[PDB]
Hints:
The structure is a homotrimer of 259-residue chains.
Chain A: H1 21-48, H2 68-88, H3 103-119, H4 125-144, H5 150-176, H6 181-194, H7 200-205, H8 217-252
Helix pairs in contact in A: 1-2, 1-8, 2-3, 2-8, 3-4, 3-8, 4-5, 6-8
One sodium ion (NA) is lined by residues 68-69, 72, 112, 115, 235-236, 239 of chain A.
Amino acid sequence: PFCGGRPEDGWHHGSIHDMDYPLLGAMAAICSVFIGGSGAWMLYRLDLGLGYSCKPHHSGYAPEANSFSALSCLVSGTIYAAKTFDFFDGGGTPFSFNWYWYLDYVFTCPLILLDVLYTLEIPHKLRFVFAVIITLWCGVAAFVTPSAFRFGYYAVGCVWFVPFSFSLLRHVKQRYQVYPPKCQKILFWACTIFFGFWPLFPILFLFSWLGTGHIDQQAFTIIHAFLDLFCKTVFGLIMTFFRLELEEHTEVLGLPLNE
Amino acid sequence: PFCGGRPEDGWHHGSIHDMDYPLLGAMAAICSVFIGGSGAWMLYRLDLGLGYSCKPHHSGYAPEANSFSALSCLVSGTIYAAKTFDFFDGGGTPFSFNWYWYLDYVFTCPLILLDVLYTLEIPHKLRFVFAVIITLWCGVAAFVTPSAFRFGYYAVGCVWFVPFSFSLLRHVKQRYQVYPPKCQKILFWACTIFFGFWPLFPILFLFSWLGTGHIDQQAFTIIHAFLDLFCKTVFGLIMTFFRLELEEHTEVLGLPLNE
Amino acid sequence: PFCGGRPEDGWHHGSIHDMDYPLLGAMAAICSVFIGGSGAWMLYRLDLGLGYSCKPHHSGYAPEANSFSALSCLVSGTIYAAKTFDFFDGGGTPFSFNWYWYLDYVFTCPLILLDVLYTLEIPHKLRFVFAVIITLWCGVAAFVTPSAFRFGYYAVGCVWFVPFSFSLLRHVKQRYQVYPPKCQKILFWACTIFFGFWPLFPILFLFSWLGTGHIDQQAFTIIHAFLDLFCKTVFGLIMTFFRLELEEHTEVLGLPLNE
Ligand code: NA
Ligand code: NA
Ligand code: NA
Ligand code: NA
Ligand code: NA
Ligand code: NA
Ligand code: NA
Ligand code: NA
Ligand code: NA
Ligand code: NA
Ligand code: NA
Ligand code: NA
Ligand code: NA
Ligand code: NA
Ligand code: NA
Ligand code: NA
Ligand code: NA
Ligand code: NA
Ligand code: NA
Ligand code: NA
Ligand code: NA
Ligand code: NA
Ligand code: NA
Ligand code: NA
Ligand code: NA
Ligand code: NA
Ligand code: NA
Ligand code: NA
Ligand code: NA
Ligand code: NA
Ligand code: NA
Ligand code: NA
Ligand code: NA
Ligand code: NA
Ligand code: NA
Ligand code: NA
Ligand code: NA
Ligand code: NA
Ligand code: NA
Ligand code: NA
Ligand code: NA
Ligand code: NA
Ligand code: NA
Ligand code: NA
Ligand code: NA
Ligand code: NA
Ligand code: NA
Ligand code: NA
């Protein structure tokens, strides 16, 4: 996908790519080990057994759709390792997961969403996943367009995200009442990261260098790194503990859900 | 995927890209609203209920594989919005869904096919989808190759499409007889768009600027826009009404299919 | 994905791309017909019926996940046809499946793996497929990086492959004992190509022009062509005959597996 990165004299001072790459690479390395390591603990804990009491799994193995939290974190930790490699080489390298904004999210956010859809038994899974993929590609396109048609790609994703988010909130509110009081407490916090932090990504674009010019690319990277520590690892850990409490109630104690 | 689009003085007169972009953008905008709006009505009508009498769905929600018609139309309307943005910027923009011919079809045509495969309960779904993806990438490659090896990529897709189409016609003829007389009437017309219009795409290449030079890129765009109004929206609407009649017979009236 | 291929004066003598393209194209043509033709025989034989006695399939059609061997071979034969077209045009063509090393494997190796996972009824299918995709993209990135950070991408894939391969070996050893003596003999040989040849790909990188400089790009292509004749076609044929013997025991003779 690339045709031109770092110039031979280095980045020109005044470019959006003239950043502190040693600092950014350090932050990406911390994120890599944190997010990827959280996904590895998550995988380990899945295989340990069912709830908090670790009841042996029914088939002997973990359900396949219980792994999306772990996988999103393990894939994002790998993407952050690629990012540290680019930042430590000074930017603009042939394989850069830093260059195209939101491309890394095309591969990670569908998995975070699948985690919710499967854990909460949400209908219209295909419609929801397709929606999110469309939206993320509109963001990729908005960052790549050098004209005011970047606001057209931005608005097309908003036309896909506003319906998606309202439909999902409705569905998750319906499911919330089925859950036991202890699992509803964990879910509250997952819903505040999924529906409270997901809308911030679009607003940050509006204040960026491709918007009002308040947030530069270096600051945008730091903000997104912190947002990914919450929207990937904290989210996945909350979702793992929701499932452990769910299955401690439903599988280990055999009690029922409040339909 | 891009390395060079519009020159700074504009397109050179005599290039394949020297077209009437204001007119093409207008046509793409009409297509966007028409195809995307048809996909939105389709989604609405899916959720309304089962047949023409709108019987409540069994699970409360629509079956997941009943949404492929709507999704193909909604995705193509979004791709046509991206196309209007490129045409209104004058062509050759970093994110151009106009530049690489048949790339938009790599993402939309598998969904049109899945709609048929699932609605008509066709076997070998993986083989058929894989086949179509291969073929479309051979077309992408044929448009990108500047030599006579473009006819080798073209012929490799023909080696994948001729078997696919004959195998699918056999399968759809077998399924046709299971359906009731009223649903067979709607299906006739779907089969004439799927098996009558799908083969025209390869013939148009042979008369294009990469073939005999009768059809330029501007005319090729207009032809494909009209073909997409029939192969996406008219097809999906016929497929929706086939399903409404099917389920009015089988679900609402509880009558059986003629095995 | 491309921005620059063959120069107008041709490749410079001393480039990694100054190779014997007429010879390489001939080898790719042989591979195309061999691998693709093996996938076509495999498809034919799937549809013939169940075991060696060709018992009619239960649904009338072959199970969908019995086709991954055929599909991997048919897709690799098509990729090798694209490769012959590039080699016969002299290299560096816009659509080159030769340029980016291991990109062709991103599309073929997941299907070889799915064949094993489904045939041997292996758990954690998503985890295994995701793992392999990650690893192959790290290899794509290692071949594209011009610095010593190529060894960082290489090592990140090794961190994904070593766990994958050990976990799969454990799982396949568990499944091996369920199978009858005759099917265990065929499986031995499949396991020697899957677990004996798969690790050679990483070692070849270390001796390549991006490693110690013993293996040039021309020799690397020939080695990989031979490796693909074994890891695609020989593997798929062994897997087909394992399934025919399995189903001759379990379906045709109705005998049971040794749990
Ligand atoms: Na940069
Ligand atoms: Na998990
Ligand atoms: Na998750
Ligand atoms: Na960069
Ligand atoms: Na990128
Ligand atoms: Na970025
Ligand atoms: Na960045
Ligand atoms: Na970044
Ligand atoms: Na950038
Ligand atoms: Na960008
Ligand atoms: Na990004
Ligand atoms: Na990115
Ligand atoms: Na949630
Ligand atoms: Na970042
Ligand atoms: Na996560
Ligand atoms: Na859990
Ligand atoms: Na153009
Ligand atoms: Na629909
Ligand atoms: Na359709
Ligand atoms: Na264009
Ligand atoms: Na394009
Ligand atoms: Na086009
Ligand atoms: Na065009
Ligand atoms: Na076009
Ligand atoms: Na073009
Ligand atoms: Na093209
Ligand atoms: Na096109
Ligand atoms: Na296109
Ligand atoms: Na049809
Ligand atoms: Na068009
Ligand atoms: Na459609
Ligand atoms: Na319908
Ligand atoms: Na070359
Ligand atoms: Na097969
Ligand atoms: Na295989
Ligand atoms: Na080449
Ligand atoms: Na390539
Ligand atoms: Na290659
Ligand atoms: Na090569
Ligand atoms: Na090659
Ligand atoms: Na190369
Ligand atoms: Na390469
Ligand atoms: Na390769
Ligand atoms: Na390749
Ligand atoms: Na094996
Ligand atoms: Na090769
Ligand atoms: Na194979
Ligand atoms: Na078989």
